[PDB]
Each structure stands twice: as structure tokens, then as C-alpha cells.
């Protein structure tokens, strides 16, 4: 039942329950003349919610907050953006105005400022070196090293065995690499290796765009990235 790009009008947000207390949020955006879906995560944090990533823009992120209230009804109190690009931080201003405490690593905040993108308020400590992991409410944040971007984080939900890869992990239907201008193509396979070694127990893997799957999505992503490097 996972919604695909043709099933979500731009401006609307859909939620998909992955496991007890874990949802993905799915939105769509026009970009480069195409339409792309984009995922983030919602994790129950007691009687509150932790949000992972915006819904790629102010309008989409307002729709995200509305859909969360309609379908879940717990307040979003904190949000983490997993790298500095607009599908992760675009809409941070909307979150901030709604009383959400927004977070990102120091590297993400700096890169967002350089790029002209919205800047999450709070700085996450302990994620500056490859292999670093820190617990943050009901998730673990992991910096695997540079991949899709130099700052990209992944998010593990231990209670539900859900690994959220953000844009460092590709869905299976994507067999070519795109929008890699800020990527470290050479390090990306090694960074995925670090993810597999650190979260071998993941049952579900959620890419930044497209359908969830299992841990196969990690090897798939390595295969596609390597093929692009060699092309
Ligand atoms: C423009 C998007 C976005 C940008 C970024 O973060 O680099 C920024 C706007 O936030 N992230 C994307 C990604 O690749 O992670 C792409 S969408 C991806 C491209 N594509 C080709 N076939 C299927 N897809 C999905
Ligand atoms: Cl961007
Ligand atoms: Cl705050
Ligand atoms: Cl706060
Ligand atoms: Zn990106
Ligand atoms: Zn605060
Ligand atoms: Zn992306």
C-alpha cells in the first residue's frame, strides 16, 4: 500500500505506518521538470512525536503538520534534518513557527547557511566523525561518512528495527544516480559499508525517495553509485 509518486498530488502529504510508533511521511515536489516523491520519518516519543526531515518545502511541510494532527494527534516537539538540502530542511521555518524545536548537525547548519537554505535552530553534538552515533529521543543518529552529501545522517529506530537512510540510500526502482553534485561518490560505498556493519539488525530500510525495503537497499545503492562513478 506504500504511496508512489503518481499517487500524491504536489502539496499533499501522506503517512504510512511502518511499525508500532513509526511512520514515514511522503510528499512530492516538482524539480528539474520532473515530479519526485520524498520520504521522511515520524517516531513516537512517549506522548510526543519526533520528526525526521521536512516534507520538501513550506507548503508541503504545513500539509505534513496538518496530516500528523489529523491522523496521529500527538504534538511534534522536535525535528531532525538529515542533511542540508531543501528536501530535508525546506520547511524548517514552518516547523519553527509551529513550535517545533528543529535540530541538525553543526555541519548541516553551516552548509545550509552557505547554500541559502533554512537553518535548523539547535546543533546536534557528537556526530562530526565517521562512525559516530548518538541517541536522540527514541532514535539513534549515525554519521556514516560522506555519501549523498558530506553531512548526511542516517536514523535508526531501535524499538522497531527501522533504518531511515535519507538520500544516502536509494530505492530499488532507481537504477541510476542523479543530483550528486554535492556527493562524495568515492566515499559513498565505504559509508554504506559502515551502515551495514552498524545496523545489521535493521528489518526495514527507508530511502530518502521511494519505496521502503529491506537491507538489500544498501547493496543496491552501492551498485548504482559505483556504476555512475564508472560511467
Ligand atoms: C532533487 C531531489 C533532492 C535534492 C537533494 O537533496 O539532492 C534537493 C532538492 O533536496 N534529493 C534528491 C535525491 O536524489 O536524494 C533528488 S530526487 C531523486 C532524483 N531522482 C531521479 N530518479 C529518481 N529520483 C529521486
Ligand atoms: Cl538544496
Ligand atoms: Cl527551539
Ligand atoms: Cl527546545
Ligand atoms: Zn540532498
Ligand atoms: Zn529549542
Ligand atoms: Zn533527496
From TrEMBL:
Gene Ontology annotations of biological process type: antibiotic catabolic process; response to antibiotic
Residues that bind Zn(2+) 1: 83, 85, 148
Record keyword Iron present: no
Entry function: Class B beta-lactamase which confers resistance to the beta-lactam antibiotics, including penicillins, cephalosporins and carbapenems. Acts via hydrolysis of the beta-lactam ring. Has penicillin-, cephalosporin- and carbapenem-hydrolyzing activities.
InterPro entries for this protein: BlaB//VIM/IMP-1, Metallo-B-lactamas, NDM-1-like, RibonucZ/Hydroxyglut_hydro, VIM-1/2/7, VIM-1/2_MBL
Binding site for Zn(2+) 3: 122
Reactions performed catalytically: a beta-lactam + H2O = a substituted beta-amino acid
Similarity field: Belongs to the metallo-beta-lactamase superfamily. Class-B beta-lactamase family.
One family name in Pfam for this protein: Lactamase_B
Keyword Repeat: no
All copies of domain Metallo-beta-lactamase, residue ranges: 37-209
Compartments in which it is found: Periplasm
Subunit structure: Monomer.
EC number: 3.5.2.6
Binding-site list for Zn(2+) 2: 87, 167, 209
SMART domains hit by this protein: Lactamase_B
GO cellular component annotations of the record: periplasmic space
Cofactor(s) this protein cannot do without: Zn(2+)
EC class (word): hydrolase
Molecular function in Gene Ontology: beta-lactamase activity; metal ion binding
Keyword field: Antibiotic resistance, Hydrolase, Metal-binding, Periplasm, Signal, Zinc
Name assigned to this protein: beta-lactamase
Amino acid at each position: 500500500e506504500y504511496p508512489t509518486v503518481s499517487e500524491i498530488p504536489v502539496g499533499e502529504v501522506r503517512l504510512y505506518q511502518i511499525a508500532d510508533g513509526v511512520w514515514s511521511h511522503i510528499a512530492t515536489q516538482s524539480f528539474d521538470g520532473a515530479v519526485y516523491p520524498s520520504n521522511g520519518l515520524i517516531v513516537r516519543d512517549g506522548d510526543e512525536l519526533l520528526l525526521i526531515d521536512t516534507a520538501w518545502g513550506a507548503k508541503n511541510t504545513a500539509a505534513l503538520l496538518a496530516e500528523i494532527e489529523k491522523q496521529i494527534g500527538l504534538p511534534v516537539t522536535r525535528a531532525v534534518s538529515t542533511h542540508f538540502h531543501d528536501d530535508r530542511v525546506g520547511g524548517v521555518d514552518v516547523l519553527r513557527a509551529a513550535g517545533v524545536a528543529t535540530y541538525a548537525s553543526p555541519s548541516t547548519r553551516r552548509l545550509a547557511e552557505v547554500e541559502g537554505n533554512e537553518i535548523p535552530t539547535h546543533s546536534l553534538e557528537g556526530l562530526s566523525s565517521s562512525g559516530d552515533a548518538v541517541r536522540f529521543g527514541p532514535v539513534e543518529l549515525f554519521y556514516p561518512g560522506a555519501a549523498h552529501s558530506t553531512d548526511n545522517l542516517v536514523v535508526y529506530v531501535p524499538s522497531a528495527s527501522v533504518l531511515y537512510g535519507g538520500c544516502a540510500i536509494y530505492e530499488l526502482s532507481r537504477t541510476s544516480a542523479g543530483n550528486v553534485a554535492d556527493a562524495d561518490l568515492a566515499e559513498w560505498p565505504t559509508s554504506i559499508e559502515r551502515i551495514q556493519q552498524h545496523y545489521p539488525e535493521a528489518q526495514f530500510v527507508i530511502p530518502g525517495h521511494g519505496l521502503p525495503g529491506g537491507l538489500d537497499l544498501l547493496k543496491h545503492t552501492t551498485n548504482v553509485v559505483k556504476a555512475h562513478t564508472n560511467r
